[PDB]
Amino acid sequence: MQIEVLIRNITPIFSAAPGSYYVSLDGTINPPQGASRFPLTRARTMTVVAETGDGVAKAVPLPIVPGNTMRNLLRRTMLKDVIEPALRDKSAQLSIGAYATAYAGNSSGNPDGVPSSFDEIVTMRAHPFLGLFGGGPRMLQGRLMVDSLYPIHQFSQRIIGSDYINDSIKGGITEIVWTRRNDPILQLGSPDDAAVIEGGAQAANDWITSLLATTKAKKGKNGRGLKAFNAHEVVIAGVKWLWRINVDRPSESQIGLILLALNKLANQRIAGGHAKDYGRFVIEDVILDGESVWTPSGVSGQATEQFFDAIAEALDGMTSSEFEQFAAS
Amino acid sequence: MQIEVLIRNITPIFSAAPGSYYVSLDGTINPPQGASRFPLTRARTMTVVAETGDGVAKAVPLPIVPGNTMRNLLRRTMLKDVIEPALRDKSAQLSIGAYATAYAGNSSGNPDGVPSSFDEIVTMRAHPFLGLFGGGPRMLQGRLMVDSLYPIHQFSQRIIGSDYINDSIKGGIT
Amino acid sequence: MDFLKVTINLGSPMVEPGDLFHLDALLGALRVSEVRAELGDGINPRDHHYDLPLEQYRSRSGQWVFKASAFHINKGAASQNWMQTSRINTAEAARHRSEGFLLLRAAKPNPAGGPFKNSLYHYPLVWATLTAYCVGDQARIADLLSQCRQIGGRRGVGCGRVAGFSVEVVPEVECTWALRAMPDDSEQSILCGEYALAMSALQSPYWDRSLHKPALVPTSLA
Amino acid sequence: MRYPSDVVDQVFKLPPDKGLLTWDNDPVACSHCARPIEKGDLYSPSSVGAFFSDTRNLASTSRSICWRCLILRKKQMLNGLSYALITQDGVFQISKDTNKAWLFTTPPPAPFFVMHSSSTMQHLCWRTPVTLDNRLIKVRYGNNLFVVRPEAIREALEIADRMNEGQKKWQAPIFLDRKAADSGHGALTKAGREHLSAADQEFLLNITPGERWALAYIMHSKRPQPEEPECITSKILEKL
DNA sequence: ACGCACGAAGACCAAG
Numbered sequence A: 001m002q003i004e005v006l007i008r009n010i011t012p013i014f015s016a017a018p019g020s021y022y023v024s025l026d027g028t029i030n031p032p033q034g035a036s037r038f039p040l041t042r043a044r045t046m047t048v049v050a051e052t053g054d055g056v057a058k059a060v061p062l063p064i065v066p067g068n069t070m071r072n073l074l075r076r077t078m079l080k081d082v083i084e085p086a087l088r089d090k091s092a093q094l095s096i097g098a099y100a101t102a103y104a105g106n107s108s109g110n111p112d113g114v115p116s117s118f119d120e121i122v123t124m125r126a127h128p129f130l131g132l133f134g135g136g137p138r139m140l141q142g143r144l145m146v147d148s149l150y151p152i153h154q155f156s157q158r159i160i161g162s163d164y165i166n167d168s169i170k171g172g173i174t175e176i177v178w179t180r181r182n183d184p185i186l187q188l189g190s191p192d193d194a195a196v197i198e199g200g201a202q203a204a205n206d207w208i209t210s211l212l213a214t215t216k217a218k219k220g221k222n223g224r225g226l227k228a229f230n231a232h233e234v235v236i237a238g239v240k241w242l243w244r245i246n247v248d249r250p251s252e253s254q255i256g257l258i259l260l261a262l263n264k265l266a267n268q269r270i271a272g273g274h275a276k277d278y279g280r281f282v283i284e285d286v287i288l289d290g291e292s293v294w295t296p297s298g299v300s301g302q303a304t305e306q307f308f309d310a311i312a313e314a315l316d317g318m319t320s321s322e323f324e325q326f327a328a329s
Numbered sequence B: 001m002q003i004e005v006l007i008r009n010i011t012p013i014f015s016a017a018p019g020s021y022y023v024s025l026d027g028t029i030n031p032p033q034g035a036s037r038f039p040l041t042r043a044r045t046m047t048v049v050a051e052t053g054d055g056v057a058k059a060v061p062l063p064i065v066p067g068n069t070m071r072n073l074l075r076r077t078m079l080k081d082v083i084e085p086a087l088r089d090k091s092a093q094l095s096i097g098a099y100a101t102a103y104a105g106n107s108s109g110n111p112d113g114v115p116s117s118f119d120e121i122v123t124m125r126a127h128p129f130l131g132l133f134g135g136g137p138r139m140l141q142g143r144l145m146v147d148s149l150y151p152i153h154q155f156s157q158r159i160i161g162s163d164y165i166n167d168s169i170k171g172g173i174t
Numbered sequence C: 001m002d003f004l005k006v007t008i009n010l011g012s013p014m015v016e017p018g019d020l021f022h023l024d025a026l027l028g029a030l031r032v033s034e035v036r037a038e039l040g041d042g043i044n045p046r047d048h049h050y051d052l053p054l055e056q057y058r059s060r061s062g063q064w065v066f067k068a069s070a071f072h073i074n075k076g077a078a079s080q081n082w083m084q085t086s087r088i089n090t091a092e093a094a095r096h097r098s099e100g101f102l103l104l105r106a107a108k109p110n111p112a113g114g115p116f117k118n119s120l121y122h123y124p125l126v127w128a129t130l131t132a133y134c135v136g137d138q139a140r141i142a143d144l145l146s147q148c149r150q151i152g153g154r155r156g157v158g159c160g161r162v163a164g165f166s167v168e169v170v171p172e173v174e175c176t177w178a179l180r181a182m183p184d185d186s187e188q189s190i191l192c193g194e195y196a197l198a199m200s201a202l203q204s205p206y207w208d209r210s211l212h213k214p215a216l217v218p219t220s221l222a
Numbered sequence D: 001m002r003y004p005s006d007v008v009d010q011v012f013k014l015p016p017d018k019g020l021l022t023w024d025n026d027p028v029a030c031s032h033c034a035r036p037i038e039k040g041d042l043y044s045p046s047s048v049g050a051f052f053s054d055t056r057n058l059a060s061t062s063r064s065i066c067w068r069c070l071i072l073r074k075k076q077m078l079n080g081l082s083y084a085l086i087t088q089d090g091v092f093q094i095s096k097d098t099n100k101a102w103l104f105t106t107p108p109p110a111p112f113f114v115m116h117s118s119s120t121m122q123h124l125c126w127r128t129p130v131t132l133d134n135r136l137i138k139v140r141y142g143n144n145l146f147v148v149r150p151e152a153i154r155e156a157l158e159i160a161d162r163m164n165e166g167q168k169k170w171q172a173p174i175f176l177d178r179k180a181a182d183s184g185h186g187a188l189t190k191a192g193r194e195h196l197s198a199a200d201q202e203f204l205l206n207i208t209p210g211e212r213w214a215l216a217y218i219m220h221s222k223r224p225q226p227e228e229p230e231c232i233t234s235k236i237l238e239k240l
Numbered sequence E: 001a002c003g004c005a006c007g008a009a010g011a012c013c014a015a016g
């Protein structure tokens, strides 16, 4: 059952790409060794082949949010908003194995490997939450197959398709944000500012003396000071994204849980940058097998009423024993 | 919780954008090499996607104030005007390391790399100040999601919404 | 009963298989998906994944293999090392431990190992056109491949979406079905190229280590 | 040698431990090495503990471990077999680059297992499949199951040598990481991009991940000279 | 009595 979620990011989305990358003050990525280099944390990019000026399609880096990140985002939304409160209402208590299986699919509850009977597989793969995300000691296959967050861009037309040509952006959708850290002791200006420090002026003097000695030693040639200047690449705000979620053979409860998470999804962030408020977005359209089920007040309407009732009934009858059995603890 | 604060700048706002730029006497940025060029420290701009009157969406630069700058402004206000007066009223002295951690998140450039105990995490994240910003040698997750300063502009309509359209300013604000 | 060439086109990059990706394995997975759709999840997967429209090759010792070559990987771009992690948020875990939702007595998490372990793993992503040759029914193979949405591993995170597929009847001279894990005593004449003896399964599932056997695996395909 | 656990009684010659239960039911494979546990074979139920992070690599859900695996699962055995090459004659250490080059260019003829840990300590030996033919070498590096073909390694080394025979500044045709972790692992470098023919570029893009990992050790400005690794089974036995 | 918890420990080559 296809779900098409159209997402517009209010704030820049920062999915840090692994690796050590460098940039200069002018913005040149990986500058030559002649000029000063500053560390850079680039956004995640997937190499895709795109028709750059027609001709022969060439590989271009497309900034995306990884599919695993959004799989975990959906899981966290479900747990934090519709599952964990439901279990608290029953005063349910989760063991370490059940908690690990629910929140990360970990198998530390019983890593020996547990045999699952066919009746048990039917019972547990139909669980409203644990059926969607498999794992645990059983390592059941989850019913959920989420995709990455591909922006509606000229280079993603071979992945997204031509259905959203009106919302496409032609230029590059990344930028470099420069970040600086200051030594607070270097910004004291009077004994009033140093009053709260136990050593008063002597502690600040010792700190500055040690900083000067370390800086001079490093210049001539351990420990690192607080002053730092670096950069990181983020995907600019306002770009539209298409998110695709699929399920193999869902029950009504699982689709209802998906729709509840979608209703509560905007309260969460995408990728990283929690300190800088990165990843904020608004859902613009949810499409359930070709029909639009998104209203201004969230996913509603008669076409999605059965799923909500089914998931409400499943939540009311939800017990921690199901989680314990799934975790095989 | 979502807090939206509306700000009007009495005096011009200057946030230096790193990097060398040049301007001519006329006012043309990065002029042709034939004319005389003078160093220029441009205001920081963030590229944003704006739906102009043409109906198409294009990436445009928007003069902003960084979210890190606003975060440090909030932290410095909190410390210098609320927390530190209380500490001095009760005659509480911070060490130099605690001072640097409260004002910059960490007391040095080397994170510990050792996990924190669960009770320590709960205690710090419930703290009025350290819970909001976090950090420390054991890099803790704070509660404060603080954003940049976006001018209410025609170019920031897709970001901040359309409930402040009456305060929007059309032309260049730089 | 008919020589075919199965071609798969990708709409998203797939996970580059570490070992051979067999056409009969994919067909068996799709057939098991059909049986799950009709009956349910309580079926034994091993009772239905042999019901494929492919004829079998049987060697002298009775070892049999489906006549479906391992998929050929031709890369439209260089492979990309995709990084993924796994972690439990220690802030939420500590809060749940405080509030009694989680029953844990340990004072601190251990990111090196245990329930709160951070893990770093990588797998490669490739843009490829999958081509393989098989002996079987064109109509039924095309019908089975119609329901296939993704190719390769890591399907849960949306890797390897199928843009389209095609099944074509080709002359035997183009290529053979023998580019797969052959039985140990497979006849030399039917083998295409050099085959190196290795340990692999001859039937799906190929990941089952109890079913692994000394088999001839093509060196120009692994 | 047929199973990973076969190394115990064949190169370590360790008798089974005491207090082990005897299987008296229908045969079922070991949860670690997939070895059948028939009637009369000494086994032990699975007690891996909460720090076992290899549930995905378990061969079966029988929750039974043979005595050879129990010997393999000892800490002394795990540490000793972190960078070990176990052939029929004995156990060698491939930790050095020269040993890796020798193994991946001039492998031993007999069946052997190749291990390499990607971290401080990992469960490797019971996961590594046996290399039946030296032309198709199966290498277990941490959590990745690698297939290394020595002919492809030799061809890539020759490609690099032809590319950099004249220029004084040696440049790697393909970007390679010894940890197989960088996002540029296996991608063509610039110098290889505009200094290699179409056929050589196609060959470099069509190498297995294991071959990239091996070339990340063998391919440098000064290629290591292959050398025979030193036997280690005496050290492991002494420490056990 | 039994399961969980906590620290010491041991493999270690090493580049562009």
Ligand SMILES: [Zn+2]
Binding pocket: D005, D030, D031, D032, D033, D034, D035, D065, D066, D068, D069, D126
């Ligand atoms: Zn075993």
